[PDB]
Design a protein around this ligand. Sequence first.
Ligand SMILES: *C(=O)[C@@H](NC(=O)[C@H](N)c1ccccc1)[C@@H]1N[C@@H](C(=O)O)C(C)(C)S1
Length: 260
Amino acid sequence: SAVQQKLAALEKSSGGRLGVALIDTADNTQVLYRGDERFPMCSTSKVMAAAAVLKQSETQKQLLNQPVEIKPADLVNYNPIAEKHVNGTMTLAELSAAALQYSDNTAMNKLIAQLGGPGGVTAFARAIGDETFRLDRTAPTLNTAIPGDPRDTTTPRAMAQTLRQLTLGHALGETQRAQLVTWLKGNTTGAASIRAGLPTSWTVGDKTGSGDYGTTNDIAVIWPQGRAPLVLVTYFTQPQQNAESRRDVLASAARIIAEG
Ligand SMILES: *C(=O)[C@@H](NC(=O)[C@H](N)c1ccccc1)[C@@H]1N[C@@H](C(=O)O)C(C)(C)S1
């Protein structure tokens, strides 16, 4: 096609490996680039953990109000919000918001513990029809992003289809869906990623990720005004273990996608 030529040229100019999946819900048409290759999800897997807790709250009506202790031993590499409530408590709602909007790794580990381990997160993916998503580790070691390692990976095609069913489809309840959409719209980490390549008039809910090997990820659901929504997944990884993050590549991929 044409978008695929520019995405291929962008990837060639970056020195790394790019994965992109677009779903246009108007005709259920898809644009993919390496859409069936595995990529390290890094923190974009937090959307699946928050959605799995939300699915539990459909039965446990007061689940999101349940307090959870934050103890000093719970503290890991990056904890912007849970650092503030050490030796205190946080509800599951505020942990889900910390995980999605600030990418708090302690908050993610509390979501994983609430689901009974990483296998509880993968189980929820399979229950909604995602046979590709696999979460094996807690944070931060899920961000190792080793080339060829299948752990904590997915493909862009599967992630785009899953994010659509969670935020646009009916894989969740209506109250649960709207709460996740509200959370993703309030993300604070994605200004330089997919958001930077889209028209300002567009409202975006997204979750970013990053890890070793210069892994730089972003998944997003886009609402253009007067237009049916879109789902966009951009994954990027590099050959150097110490490589710097390349959020500019995700913006460029999004800009290429938005043009056509
Ligand atoms: C998931 O992607 C998380 N990433 C990490 O914990 C990495 N080990 C890390 C990379 C760089 C600096 C600190 C930790 C969290 N989500 C990232 C993101 O959304 O970009 C993060 C850097 C905010 S941490």
